[PDB]
Each structure stands twice: as C-alpha cells, then as structure tokens.
Design a protein around this ligand. Structure first.
Ligand SMILES: NC(=O)C1=CN([C@@H]2O[C@H](COP(=O)(O)OP(=O)(O)OC[C@H]3O[C@@H](n4cnc5c(N)ncnc54)[C@H](O)[C@@H]3O)[C@@H](O)[C@H]2O)C=CC1
Ligand SMILES: O=C(O)[C@@H](O)[C@@H](O)[C@H](O)[C@H](O)CO
Length: 483
C-alpha cells in the first residue's frame, strides 16, 4: 500500500542494497534521521549501503509493522511553510530478539559484510553512570550478561558477543557508532564495551581495542513520539496509513568523526559533516538545544504547557530559553566558525514549529540521564569562571520540583526515569523545601561529587526552588527572564 503514497518513493533497486550496517534501537529518531541519510545516498549517489534494523529491548511493534509492508516506512517533514513525505527503502531486514530470536540477530551481526553497528538505544541503554560515563558493573542487567555472555540481553553484551564470534571466524571487526545524545558518545561506547569485555575475556578486550573504532557523532532533528494524531496526519498528507510512519521537522544535522575500520557510506554527500573532532558541536547542540529543551520541559509542564510550541507562546518562556541559550550556554562553548546568536534564533524558530506537537512530558523523560550534559557541565564552566548561571539553576530546580511527583494543581506526575527508585527514595525521605534540594543533590550518579559539595550551586538552586514553591513555575520563569 505504501507505494501508492503521495510521497517520494524508492526508485533505486532495493535488492541491490547490501545489508552493511546493523542498527540497534529502531525508534522514531533513527527512522527520520540516519535512515533518511542512507535513503538519499541510495537514491542520488549510487550507495549500496542498506540496514539490518534490530530491537533488543522494547520496540516490538515497529519491527512487526515493517515485516508486513516489505520493510518500507514513511517519514513526513512538517513545518509552518511546507510538508514533504518520503517512503524510505534502505531496510533489508527488521529483527526483534523476541520474534526472530537472539541467535538470528547474532548471526546477522556476524555476516562478513557488516561494517558498522550503530545505536540509538537512549542514554539509559548503555547502563553507565550519567555523572562518570562509566559502565555500572553492579547493575543487574550488566551482571546478568557477564554471567551469561553468550546469551546477552544488553546492547553492549550483544555487540561484544558478535565481535567474539567474528574474531573466532577470522572476520574483520566492525566500527561501533553511537548516535545517542551524550557528549563524546563514542568514548562512552568505547568505555562500556571495554569495561564489559575485560569483565568476561581479556584477550577479546585487547582484540577489540586493536580492531574496533568508536567514532563520536552529533545528531539533530526534532522527532516527537508518534501518536494516533500523528498517524492520522501522515495519512491525510500521503493518502496512506502507515503504522511505522514518523513525523519530524525539516531541519537535520549529523556531525560524524571520520574514523571507521571497514568503510562507511558517503554520508557527507547527503549533508553529513565528516570531520576530525565532533566534541565542540556535541557540546553546542546538547547545551543550547537540549539544555533549553529540558529547561522548557520541566518548567513548561509545571506551568501546564503540554507542548514546546505551547511554551513558545509565552513570551517569558521564549525570552528565558533564548537568554539561557545565548547568555549561559553559548559562553561555555569552544566551537569556532558559528554565529551562536543566529543559532539561538534558529532554535527558537524550530521550537515554535506549529506543525509538531512535542510533549514537555516526553522531553522530561530520563532527566537523570540528561541533566549532566545538558545543564550541569555548563554550571561547572560558570563556577570555574566566576560567572552567573541563574537560568541553569532554575532549570535544575525545575527538574527537582517535577520529580517530587505532584503537579501544581495537586495531581500526580508520572515520572519516567531509570533512576526512579533512587529519586523516589530521595523525595520520600526529605521534607519539602530546602531539605528536598539537599536530598536530590545527594544523588551522585546525576550530580557527581563536586556539585553536592558546592555551596554556591546549592544556594542558587535552593533559591530557584523556593521560588517555584512560593510562586509556581510560570511566574518564576517570568521573574528569572528579566533577572
Ligand atoms: N528528537 C528525537 O527524538 C531525538 C533523539 N535522539 C536520540 O535517539 C534516541 C532515541 O530516540 P527516539 O527514537 O525518539 O526514541 P524511541 O522511544 O522512538 O526509540 C527508542 C529506541 O531505543 C530502544 N531502547 C530503549 N531502551 C533500551 C535498552 N535498555 N537497550 C536497548 N535498546 C533500548 C527501543 O527499543 C527503541 O528502539 C534518543 O534517546 C536520543 O539519544 C537524538 C536526536 C533527536
Ligand atoms: O530529550 C528529548 O527528548 C529532546 O530534548 C531531544 O530528543 C531533542 O528533540 C533532540 O535531541 C533534538 O535533536
């Protein structure tokens, strides 16, 4: 049914694509981002790089959806000015450990032509401490894989077992490319893989060290979670109902460290920035975009703004986000050759996209995994430089107020976070007010050891938090926006 859609369709020969990349975490973002880059290459630049799409944990529905429409899916770009749709054809096979089985997945990863394994498994999928970037060796998912390394359940476990098998077969290693929203995401990937391999087999660890590269990336495209309204809107645009369809903004960026062991698609031809060092761009985007996103998510949700576009209708939230981007995030950056005021202006325009409904609740998810790179590293810069960080402090206070679990009208907030048990215990064991700040600050996996030991940070977050309690989020953002 998809080939009758009002959309651009795969005009290249799909059978001529080889499955050369295995992607872990077939979610909305991968579909609308990397999948689109690959499809442009297959369409315009004679690329034969196709994908095996694999889900290991959750995401059973996406995989099943593909399996009955010849692995095709729809991406619809939407903004105020235009919409466009594309039916993507680069997926050669879509697998799920719960459907096809783990052995089939490992076998696919051990085919000789697999050159890259890429990941969008969310920050929590790495089972690392957000504050340190290091593998949690005592995490039950990690210990279970370490005890049963040939039947792994984690992404790292699966990757390392695939590598063990390739090594034993005398097959070349693949490159492992994280596309998740962490600074130096290739270092995180390298570290967790290395720590894990060393825990099970030191010869395998050394071979991995000698044969695998872990290039870092920066990825950017706003892709809200797909709802029934999303699917209905894509149907209305294309004429065809696609359960695996995704809606996104027209903007896309992908910065890639050019360090691959077994080749790569010519992504630069589809608009990727292939460079030697991605870190300054990661920090730029994680801080100015994701940091402002998070600020808006907690303080917007608490004010009763359901979506980011709703936040942008409040001139104070608009001004606060802009001031946060340019006066607090931008000065912490080392990036060269970018007009950051213009970038900030463009982010506000992107947030104001009236064609998307990006829920503050969705962005608020997994705050424990996001705070360090999005806000806390910037705070550290300001602390070291004796510089003010008022809006960052309010952002942190906003997360703290949110995870208290009761909204300003006295209704429950459903908190989604892998550290929920720790967060709940911190909330339940502390009185509202100044005690609550102290208690949440004490979660070292989020705040590290320096920030809880920092009197200035503690004072500023506490002041912001007491303002949220006394005046609510909406009025507090208004106050801080002129401050
Ligand atoms: N606007 C966006 O949605 C953007 C997302 N990203 C990155 O992509 C990641 C995924 O985003 P979406 O696709 O929108 O989310 P999604 O919820 O649509 O997909 C999440 C994917 O991660 C997998 N996953 C979840 N927990 C896992 C675990 N413990 N182990 C292995 N796999 C796991 C799921 O199976 C699913 O395939 C984000 O966490 C972020 O790092 C990056 C830029 C923009
Ligand atoms: O936390 C989130 O859900 C958002 O801040 C990001 O997914 C944001 O949409 C992207 O990273 C922008 O590329």
């Amino acid at each position: 049914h998809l080939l009758s859609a009002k959309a651009t369709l795969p005009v290249y020969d799909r059978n001529n694509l080889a499955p050369r990349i295995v992607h872990l975490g077939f979610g909305a973002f991968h579909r609308a981002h990397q999948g689109v880059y690959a499809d442009i290459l297959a369409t315009e630049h004679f690329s034969d790089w196709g994908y095996y799409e694999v889900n290991l944990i959750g995401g059973e529905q996406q995989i099943a959806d593909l399996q009955q429409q010849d692995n095709l899916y729809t991406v619809a770009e939407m903004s105020a000015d235009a919409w466009t749709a594309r039916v993507v054809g680069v997926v050669k096979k879509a697998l799920h450990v719960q459907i096809d089985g783990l052995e089939t997945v490992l076998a696919a990863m051990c085919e000789p032509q697999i050159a890259i394994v890429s990941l969008t498994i969310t920050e929590k999928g790495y089972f690392h401490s957000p504050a340190t970037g290091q593998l949690m060796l005592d995490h039950p998912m990690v210990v279970a894989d370490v005890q049963n390394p040939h039947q792994p359940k984690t992404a790292t476990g699966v990757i390392v077992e695939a590598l063990a098998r390739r090594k034993a077969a005398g097959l070349p290693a693949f490159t492992v490319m994280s596309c998740d929203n962490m600074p130096e995401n290739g270092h995180v990937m390298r570290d967790v893989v290395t720590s894990y391999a060393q825990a099970i087999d030191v010869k395998l660890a050394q071979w991995i060290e000698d044969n695998v590269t872990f290039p870092s990336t920066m990825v950017d495209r706003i892709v809200p979670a797909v709802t029934e309204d999303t699917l209905a809107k894509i149907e209305q645009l294309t004429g065809v109902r696609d359960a695996a369809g995704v809606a996104c903004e027209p903007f896309r960026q992908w910065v890639i460290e050019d360090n691959f062991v077994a080749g790569r698609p010519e992504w630069e031809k589809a608009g990727a920035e292939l460079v030697s060092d991605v870190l300054p761009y990661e920090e730029m985007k994680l801080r100015m975009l994701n940091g402002s996103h998070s600020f808006l998510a907690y303080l917007g949700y608490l004010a009763g703004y359901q979506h980011i576009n709703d936040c942008m209708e409040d001139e104070h939230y608009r001004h606060a986000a802009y001031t946060l981007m340019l006066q607090e995030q931008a000065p912490t950056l080392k990036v060269q050759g970018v007009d950051l005021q213009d970038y900030a202006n463009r982010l506000i325009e992107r947030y104001s996209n009236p064609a998307l409904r990006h829920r503050t609740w969705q962005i608020a998810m997994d705050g424990s995994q996001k705070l360090p790179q999005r806000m806390l590293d910037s705070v550290r810069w300001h602390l070291a430089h004796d510089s003010k960080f008022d809006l960052l402090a309010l952002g942190v206070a906003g997360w703290m107020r949110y995870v208290g679990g009761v909204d300003e009208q006295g209704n429950p907030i459903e908190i989604s976070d892998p550290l929920l048990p720790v967060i709940q215990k911190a909330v339940q064991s502390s009185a509202e007010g100044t005690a609550r700040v102290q208690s949440l600050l004490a979660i070292k996996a989020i705040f590290g050891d320096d920030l809880p030991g920092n009197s200035l940070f503690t004072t500023k977050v506490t002041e912001a938090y007491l303002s949220l309690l006394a005046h609510g989020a909406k009025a507090t953002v208004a106050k801080y926006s002129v401050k």
